[PDB]
Amino acid sequence: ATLPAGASQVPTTPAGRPMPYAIRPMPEDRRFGYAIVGLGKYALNQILPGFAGCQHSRIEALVSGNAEKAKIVAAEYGVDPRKIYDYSNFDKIAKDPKIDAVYIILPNSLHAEFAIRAFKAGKHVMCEKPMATSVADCQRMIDAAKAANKKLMIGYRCHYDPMNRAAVKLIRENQLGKLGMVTTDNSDVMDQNDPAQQWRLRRELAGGGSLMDIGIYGLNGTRYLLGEEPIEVRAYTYSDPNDERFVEVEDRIIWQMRFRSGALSHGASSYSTTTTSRFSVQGDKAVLLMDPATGYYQNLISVQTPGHANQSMMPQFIMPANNQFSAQLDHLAEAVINNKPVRSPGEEGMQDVRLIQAIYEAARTGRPVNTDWGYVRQGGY
Amino acid sequence: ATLPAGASQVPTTPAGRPMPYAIRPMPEDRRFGYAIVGLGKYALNQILPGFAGCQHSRIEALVSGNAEKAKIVAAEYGVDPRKIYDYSNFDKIAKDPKIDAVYIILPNSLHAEFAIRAFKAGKHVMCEKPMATSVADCQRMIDAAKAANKKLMIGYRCHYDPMNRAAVKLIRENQLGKLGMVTTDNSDVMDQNDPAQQWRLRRELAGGGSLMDIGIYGLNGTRYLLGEEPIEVRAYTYSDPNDERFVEVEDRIIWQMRFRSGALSHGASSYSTTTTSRFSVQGDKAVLLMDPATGYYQNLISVQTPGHANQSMMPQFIMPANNQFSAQLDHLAEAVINNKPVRSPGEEGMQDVRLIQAIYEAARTGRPVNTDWGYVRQGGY
Amino acid sequence: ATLPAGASQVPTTPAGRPMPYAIRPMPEDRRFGYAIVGLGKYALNQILPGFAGCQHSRIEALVSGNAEKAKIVAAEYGVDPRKIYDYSNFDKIAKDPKIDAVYIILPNSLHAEFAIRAFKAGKHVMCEKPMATSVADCQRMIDAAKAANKKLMIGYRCHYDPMNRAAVKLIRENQLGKLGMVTTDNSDVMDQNDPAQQWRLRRELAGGGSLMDIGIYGLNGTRYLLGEEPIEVRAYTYSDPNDERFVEVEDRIIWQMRFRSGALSHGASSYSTTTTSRFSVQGDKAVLLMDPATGYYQNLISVQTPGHANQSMMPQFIMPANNQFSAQLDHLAEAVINNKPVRSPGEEGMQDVRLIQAIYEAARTGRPVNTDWGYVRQGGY
Amino acid sequence: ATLPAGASQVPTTPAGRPMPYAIRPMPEDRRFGYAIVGLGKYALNQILPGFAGCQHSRIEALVSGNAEKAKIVAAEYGVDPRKIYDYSNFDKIAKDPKIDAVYIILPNSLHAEFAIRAFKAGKHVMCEKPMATSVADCQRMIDAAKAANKKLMIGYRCHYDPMNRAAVKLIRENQLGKLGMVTTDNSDVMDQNDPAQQWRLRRELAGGGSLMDIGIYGLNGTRYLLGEEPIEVRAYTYSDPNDERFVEVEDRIIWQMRFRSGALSHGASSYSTTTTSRFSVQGDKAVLLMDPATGYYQNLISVQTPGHANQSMMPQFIMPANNQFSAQLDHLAEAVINNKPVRSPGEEGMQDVRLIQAIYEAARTGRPVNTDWGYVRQGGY
Ligand SMILES: NC(=O)C1=CN([C@@H]2O[C@H](COP(=O)(O)OP(=O)(O)OC[C@H]3O[C@@H](n4cnc5c(N)ncnc54)[C@H](OP(=O)(O)O)[C@@H]3O)[C@@H](O)[C@H]2O)C=CC1
Ligand SMILES: NC(=O)C1=CN([C@@H]2O[C@H](COP(=O)(O)OP(=O)(O)OC[C@H]3O[C@@H](n4cnc5c(N)ncnc54)[C@H](OP(=O)(O)O)[C@@H]3O)[C@@H](O)[C@H]2O)C=CC1
Ligand SMILES: NC(=O)C1=CN([C@@H]2O[C@H](COP(=O)(O)OP(=O)(O)OC[C@H]3O[C@@H](n4cnc5c(N)ncnc54)[C@H](OP(=O)(O)O)[C@@H]3O)[C@@H](O)[C@H]2O)C=CC1
Ligand SMILES: NC(=O)C1=CN([C@@H]2O[C@H](COP(=O)(O)OP(=O)(O)OC[C@H]3O[C@@H](n4cnc5c(N)ncnc54)[C@H](OP(=O)(O)O)[C@@H]3O)[C@@H](O)[C@H]2O)C=CC1
Structure with missing residues (x-):
């Protein structure tokens, strides 16, 4: 039993070495x-x-x-x-x-x-x-x-983002089975004292409330997780009329969507509740839980079945x-x-804007808004 | 140092002892x-x-x-x-x-x-x-x-159930702060070959689909976690038209509600996806995650804040x-x-049925249904 | 689309049904x-x-x-x-x-x-x-x-116990690779006022301290997880001299072993610290963590590799x-x-007692004790 | 109900803003x-x-x-x-x-x-x-x-490191109660083909095997977690004589230590098993689990008591x-x-070297090595 070549050839004196792994x-x-x-x-x-x-x-x-x-x-x-x-x-x-x-x-x-x-x-x-x-x-x-x-x-x-990418890959590999229900939630408590949050309260500067700001993650996410686009949309929004923060933009809003595959999704965004970034994708074989789902750091995903929770993270x-x-x-x-x-x-960013406008329209009218406008994700999700 | 009285008095031969702890x-x-x-x-x-x-x-x-x-x-x-x-x-x-x-x-x-x-x-x-x-x-x-x-x-x-009562208690102790958003999901793959599920597919016997069967947990749970009643509901349901299982009862249905406190909620029930029982209660101080939320066993809860996840279980x-x-x-x-x-x-069970009928009615007309009918929870949630 | 035979044949009036699933x-x-x-x-x-x-x-x-x-x-x-x-x-x-x-x-x-x-x-x-x-x-x-x-x-x-048998099965399926290091810990705060613990402090009645009481789980578990017997043990024990609880039996004791396969293990039992029941089995492919490892309820296992944690539980x-x-x-x-x-x-229980006596003997002399006495597990671990 | 000053004063045209939060x-x-x-x-x-x-x-x-x-x-x-x-x-x-x-x-x-x-x-x-x-x-x-x-x-x-710091703080705040048992494990499978690992196999270049390399974390960690120094030490090492990797340095080694407070610890390091960085600190009130304990990234700590697991992470x-x-x-x-x-x-780095030499001596002789040499951590752990 002798030491391997590499180890035995290392000089016991200061010497240069190759590029490390x-x-x-x-x-x-x-x-x-x-x-x-x-x-x-x-x-x-x-x-x-x-x-x-x-x-x-x-x-x-x-x-x-x-x-x-x-x-x-x-x-x-x-x-x-x-x-x-x-x-x-x-x-x-x-x-x-x-x-x-x-x-x-x-x-x-x-x-x-x-x-x-x-x-x-x-x-x-x-x-x-x-x-x-x-x-x-x-x-x-x-x-x-x-x-x-x-x-x-x-x-x-x-x-x-790695974890978000792993989530899409696992779904394309059919580890969840046939997709049928997606649930998203994105929230953060609005602070009017934070200079960055001030324009977000201005409708002409922000364009919308929590949806345009963070609800877009659930919307976008629901889209690339499912690998398809919404054909119909319904929504509702509410904000405390006494809260000075939501005079022009919505605090929270809830939107329900249907896809061509028959998959459904329900999600929300909020300006009045603590940090929340959680996605859930339900197939007929397993369920995926992304939580944190879209954080700057520490994302964590999990595939669940009775008796099992297989987690992945950096x-x-x-x-x-x-x-x-x-x-x-x-x-x-x-x-x-x-x-x-x-x-x-820009065509992908444009797609979310339309859907968001369609969502606001649905929440405004209280009726279903058809979104089956033949959009196509060039290059896959 | 010597042994305490209790230990030193134990006989070394077979002898009767006290009732145990x-x-x-x-x-x-x-x-x-x-x-x-x-x-x-x-x-x-x-x-x-x-x-x-x-x-x-x-x-x-x-x-x-x-x-x-x-x-x-x-x-x-x-x-x-x-x-x-x-x-x-x-x-x-x-x-x-x-x-x-x-x-x-x-x-x-x-x-x-x-x-x-x-x-x-x-x-x-x-x-x-x-x-x-x-x-x-x-x-x-x-x-x-x-x-x-x-x-x-x-x-x-x-x-x-100990874990549900524990989630209710931390909420009433204001550990989440002011409640603003509740999310629920209850799903299970319907198998028409299971004798128990056979009457569940018959409208006349079941009285409804996934909402009557398991969506009721999300509904009922939303009420006792929030500790209040909804003043209006909105909903939409969809079921693949070619699936023999859902000819008479609904598969998937989504319902969102608004409560007198200002809190909102969005939940869903499914006969088309696997085992899911998850409740999240968002406050402005912390977020509660119940998952499993209503299992026969192994319930698990967690209060989440940036950098923390305090879990509780049996x-x-x-x-x-x-x-x-x-x-x-x-x-x-x-x-x-x-x-x-x-x-x-009976009044509690009746309230859920009235709310469910409102939800079906809201899905059917695509209009919101006012449920501000003054139900009062006797004894608390 | 019509309903399947099973559902359509269910009577609408009170009728006897089949044995359930x-x-x-x-x-x-x-x-x-x-x-x-x-x-x-x-x-x-x-x-x-x-x-x-x-x-x-x-x-x-x-x-x-x-x-x-x-x-x-x-x-x-x-x-x-x-x-x-x-x-x-x-x-x-x-x-x-x-x-x-x-x-x-x-x-x-x-x-x-x-x-x-x-x-x-x-x-x-x-x-x-x-x-x-x-x-x-x-x-x-x-x-x-x-x-x-x-x-x-x-x-x-x-x-x-289902979770212990599941940990044994994934090990035998080579999911951890070649086994090299096992770690065990079993602890509970001794309370001399509990009638059940009173005879446990008497050497004559208990036969020993924390090792005989709960350290045996780590010992026995190390044997069935590895699927082999130790060929030698080493150990050391210590107990605060002024603590009335440990006048006759040991509080804390640490024992490490070497098995014929080359695997090693280090474990400990304690009457001085709170509830602990944790086993880790390190292989060269993955690491198993059982925690709780031997609870009356809620056992939980996890196979860990860089970037992953696959958990299992009831x-x-x-x-x-x-x-x-x-x-x-x-x-x-x-x-x-x-x-x-x-x-x-009885042979299995006897093997643990012989090993425990070897461990006490190894702690007492501060010397290693050879336990290569040819015990063979009839029927497997 | 009107918009707050800050929000209302934000120009709808390109303008400079203050330093962000x-x-x-x-x-x-x-x-x-x-x-x-x-x-x-x-x-x-x-x-x-x-x-x-x-x-x-x-x-x-x-x-x-x-x-x-x-x-x-x-x-x-x-x-x-x-x-x-x-x-x-x-x-x-x-x-x-x-x-x-x-x-x-x-x-x-x-x-x-x-x-x-x-x-x-x-x-x-x-x-x-x-x-x-x-x-x-x-x-x-x-x-x-x-x-x-x-x-x-x-x-x-x-x-x-934040998490490691949080761990020390929580222990000093007495959240674990009186400390009595520490368990550490640090492992990584040695690859002789990796240029960086080659000198580690050379005794005169590395000074020791896994202990000097990664076991030092458990040793050092056991020290600042407990907030005190070892007064006695015992150890044992073993390596497969047929493995070319450990001709000069040890693969795995197990060391047991005692402190002045009466606290005990058992830990190990390994060159033949997969990624492992886990620390465990047992008090008489709670138990702390650091896992990952000393990773480059994604550390995770948890304070456990029956029915509870309070986790912290970035x-x-x-x-x-x-x-x-x-x-x-x-x-x-x-x-x-x-x-x-x-x-x-350098006095702190010198302390680990002595203890490590004392540990090797203990493993070599198979007897206890006194380490009560009055070292003092200048400036606390
Ligand atoms: N994808 C992600 O994770 C995130 C995306 N964003 C996006 O980044 C963009 C910037 O938002 P954010 O950094 O959070 O906000 P801030 O309010 O903090 O900053 C806006 C910046 O734009 C400039 N600016 C020009 N005109 C104005 C104006 N009229 N009012 C305010 N600022 C002005 C300022 O630059 P200067 O002061 O130097 O002149 C200022 O620093 C948004 O579109 C937001 O949605 C934000 C956070 C995360
Ligand atoms: N709270 C909870 O966790 C759960 C509550 N339930 C509830 O319990 C009730 C029973 O459901 P479940 O046990 O799952 O279902 P099953 O179909 O398995 O059983 C229903 C039982 O009622 C009797 N029965 C009498 N007439 C009929 C009929 N015409 N069709 C079918 N059964 C009939 C039968 O008993 P016999 O053969 O002896 O005559 C039969 O075994 C439901 O209201 C359900 O919502 C169900 C599961 C969980
Ligand atoms: N596998 C596991 O998870 C566990 C196994 N055990 C094992 O079970 C056995 C009993 O322990 P445990 O129930 O905790 O202890 P207890 O002290 O609570 O009970 C022992 C029982 O045995 C009888 N007994 C007869 N003579 C004596 C005597 N001289 N001193 C004390 N008791 C006597 C008594 O019953 P009566 O009053 O009716 O005469 C007494 O209730 C132990 O060997 C222990 O290791 C214990 C806990 C868990
Ligand atoms: N605290 C932590 O997390 C970590 C600490 N370390 C420590 O860092 C130090 C370096 O180890 P590591 O980077 O992993 O190992 P490497 O083998 O990859 O590198 C050693 C470096 O030192 C120089 N060197 C000088 N003489 C020699 C020699 N005779 N043989 C080999 N290298 C020589 C080389 O520089 P050049 O080629 O440019 O001439 C080489 O890049 C060790 O003391 C190790 O314990 C390592 C990893 C993590």
Whole structure:
């Protein structure tokens, strides 16, 4: 019994070694450059910090309305101080060839504006959800992309989150059997004192209440989990008339949907209840519980059958996939580099907007709203 | 250091000792005699086996339409063969003073008449849920109870299940804060080859589909967790038109409600997907997840807040409270012995039936139904 | 679409129906009669209540040194008052052919003599663990069983518990790979004021401390999970010198073992810390976690690998296998009826006692003790 | 009912906003500069990627023996190509004032060498665990720090991991009661083909097997969880003599310890079994289960009592504390900036080395090894 070759050949003195094994995503290059517009809560707590983990993305320039703040951040992330644009001279980015695309992290109402604006600046557009505050503005955004022959991608991080991906895969492998009932809930207690929440209370700025904000996850999720689109929709909303927070936007709203397969779904969103992100998919073989379902971190899914609960979550020492944020950034970057369509196109973001408007209409009229308008998810869910 | 008195006084030879510490409910007496009506699935799998752990209840007689089966069951539970009754000679139980009550475990359409004949026979009545198949019949049962001066109790085992009572208690202790959103789901794959499910597919016998059968748990649970009644309901139901199972009763139905406190709820029942029994109660301080929520066994609850999940379930060595079945049985017994009302009276069962009829009515018309009819829960939830 | 034959043939009036689907063990007969010896804590809290779910067992007689208590217990379980025995007139059970066996639930030092007198009385014997307080006495019990041509079974409920048998099965199916490390812990806070614990603090009656009482589960479990016997043990024990509870028996003791396969294990038992019952079995493919591992209820197992945790526990509506207590009771009954050996014979109980004596011997000398004495598990683990 | 001031004052046109709320650690400055020596598996998968999240640390220079690789990394992390040292001219760092400290991520045997070497280069030292391969080399490292009046810190990330910190806090708050039994297990299947594992198989390079490598976590953990030091130690080790992997170092080893408080602990480490990081702390009120206990990610702790399991883990949307890696880096950085002692000093790393040697001695001799040498954890655990 003797030691193996490798071990026996290791010098007992300081010596160089080969490239170590990768048990986590390693940085490769930094060829794609982003222009981030809107230094808000998401842009600073989740997005910018997300670039560090990218393999193909960098922060080349940032666009802000607050010059003093924009100066402080530029330092932290080391972006060229001379590359700190504003809303007035945002259009001038078309002069910088090192600015491949822009990432719009502005209030919902301002999405369409800077999207078509950037498209005429010859840049790729990564717009946050919800796409826009109007089906029309969504289509105009698509038109600008086509006209400029550029890429339009919506910020659906769940489309690039490991656990969410595992959930879809397991369903496509038929581990749940025939799908028949989906249940979604997304909630967070609205704080009017938080600067980021203030515009969300303004209807012309947000476009809607909790649905447009977080209920969209359940809606979108119900869609890619089931792998199909709603053909009919019904909904109801209610808000405490005495709560100053919901004068213009809805607090909570409940929507029921039917699909071509015969599958049904019921879900809700809320501005008056604590943190909730839970999805449930019922097949005739098993039931999947995603909880947390769409968190920034610590997602956890479980396939349940009588006597069993098979849970999956990110490992404790290894990282077989990149976090949703970095994976999202690089996804646009490498969709361009390889001339490939993006998984989350403007047509997909436009689909949620229509459905949401159809849902509001259903809650407004109290009648079923037909949504069987032949939409097709290009490239699968 | 020396040994304590107790240990040092134990004889080393065979000797009598004290009553031991009780770590689970001990039997006490079998003073309250039941007559079980309908030796079917729930009866033979859950109720009859549930008598063993009772502290005041016993099986005195059986009522069956299958003499061969009754004879076998009677022998299995030491019942006197002379105490076997036909559905035709049922009324003669009035002649046996050793029969204090009957437990009706027949198809839904037959609960009313046998409860009424039981009262005419001067016996107390325990009746399974759903109470009956018409509001009118529920009232006739209540009128007969009062006319005979005997008690009327509906089989809501979840009203005597330790984990459900624990969820109710943490809610009343304001551990979730102000309640805003409740979500329920109760499902099971319908198998037309199971004899018990055969009458469930007949509208005339079942009185309805998945809502009457298992959706009632979500409905009833939403009411006792919130501790209040709904003021209006909305709903929609769908069933694949080609599925032989749902020609007369509904498969899947979704109902949402609004309560006087402002709270909302969305729930669903299914005959088309596998085992699901899950309740979530969202407050503005924390979120409660009951899953399993209403199982015959293994219920599990969890209070969730960012970074935490405090779970509760039955201990592994001790049994602080009796199981739901034995408890329910003794509950009616203790109520007559002590001359007190029951927690699940006929009025409670009637309220669920009225709400279910409202829900079916709301699904049928696609319009909301006002249910603000002033039902008051006597004794609390 | 029309209704299936079954549903359409159900009468709408009161009518007899078929035997229902069984979703839990149904009673069958009570052919095997037991005489319970020692109406203490385990007997009244677990064993007597366990007879209800038996399919072939019944309580025929009681043996107690507290006539007042026996009279009460007899009435609680419908036992014939004439079937109450003294520890002095115990031998006269030989005169009752309706008594097939006895279940010895007395302090450890008294198991041997009453098992022997039981055999002399021509009865089968179920004896609680630990089998006895000396290896020699275990052999005398075995010799008496053989001399009387009656069976000898030790109360190892975990050998008939669904979750433990499920853990054994996944192990034998190589789901963990090659077994290398097993960890066990069994603890409970000793309370000298509980009558049952009083003899446990007396060396002469208990035969030892925490190892004899509950550490035996870790020991016995390590053997059936690994499916092999230890070839040597090592150990150390410690007990606060000023604590009146541990003047004669040990509080905490740690023992580690090596098996012929190469596998190792380290476990411990405690009278000083709260409820703990946890087993982990490390293989090179996956890790098994049993926690609760040996509870009277709610056992839970999980197979863990990076990114996964597949849990198993008893279902919420169905009961595939009978509870451990009822199962253990019927097991001896089926063994004599069918003329077969039991899974927990006297030899099995004797092996644990020999191993425990080796462990105490290893702790006492601080030296390792060779236990490679060729015990062979008849019938498998 | 009107909208609140904040919301109503938000311009519906592009405008600048204030600094957003922080729900996650924000980058502040980058004043402290690190010199990372040893571009291995940890340095590249966990450490370097860890700087991005720091608030006070940057990568100023890297030391490697592989020039080609060192060139590739420098690009990825953008370190000055002219600042790529090697083992020969490592000493020259003393000339760069922008190099505040060095982080040694070299094989165990080479820890002492470059530590004292860097101390004479007038730099602060952050050495990875285990400190060194000799108690003596540990003391020499301490001497160099004192002589150079610099800071010596060991890489105990668990000392700066949220969940591990929560575990200590809860124990100090007495939520477990009086501590009496700790159980630890740390395992990973050794792969001789992995370049990083090859030196670990060499005794003069690693200093020991699984204990020195990962068993140290259980040892260290047992120490800060209990908040005290071992006074006595016993151990045993075994390795398959036919396995080429363990010719020089131990595969698995089991060690038992006793503390001044009377608390006991049993734990093990393994090179032949799958991923395992589990700690268990038993008090007389509750039991704590850390599993994962010391993972790079996804740690999970739980306080258990009969009927309860209160779990804690990182939130799903917020990040109230920085990850162990970044927190570790900045900790040295800010320990210098504020002239404060470090929580993980060389004296603490030296303590584990002694205990480990004492443990090996115990396993070698098979006798108890006294470790009551008056060590004192400066600054608490
Ligand atoms: N997918 C996900 O997980 C998340 C997506 N989002 C989305 O990101 C977008 C930004 O929202 P969020 O960061 O939370 O909110 P914030 O209120 O915190 O920030 C909005 C940002 O847009 C700019 N802005 C321009 N005009 C206005 C205006 N009139 N009122 C307010 N801000 C303005 C500001 O940049 P500056 O001050 O520098 O001038 C500000 O930092 C939204 O579309 C939201 O739906 C948000 C959170 C998560
Ligand atoms: N609370 C709970 O958890 C549960 C409550 N239930 C309730 O108990 C009641 C019985 O349901 P369940 O045991 O599942 O069903 P089953 O179909 O299995 O049994 C019904 C029984 O009633 C008698 N019966 C008399 N006339 C008829 C008839 N015309 N058609 C069918 N049966 C007849 C039969 O007994 P016999 O042969 O002896 O004449 C039969 O076994 C229902 O109201 C149901 O809602 C059911 C399951 C669970
Ligand atoms: N497998 C399992 O899960 C468990 C097994 N056990 C085992 O069962 C056996 C009994 O333990 P347990 O029920 O907890 O203890 P108890 O002390 O509560 O009862 C022992 C019983 O035996 C009789 N007895 C006769 N002589 C004595 C004596 N001198 N001192 C004390 N009792 C005497 C008494 O019955 P009477 O008054 O009627 O004369 C007494 O109630 C033990 O061997 C124990 O290891 C215990 C718990 C669990
Ligand atoms: N706390 C924690 O979580 C962890 C701590 N560690 C610790 O980090 C240290 C490094 O181990 P690890 O990264 O896993 O192992 P690696 O084998 O992957 O790397 C060792 C590094 O040290 C340098 N080195 C110098 N001389 C030698 C030599 N003779 N043989 C091998 N390498 C040499 C090499 O740098 P170059 O090739 O560039 O010249 C090499 O990259 C160890 O002390 C280990 O205990 C490791 C993992 C986790």
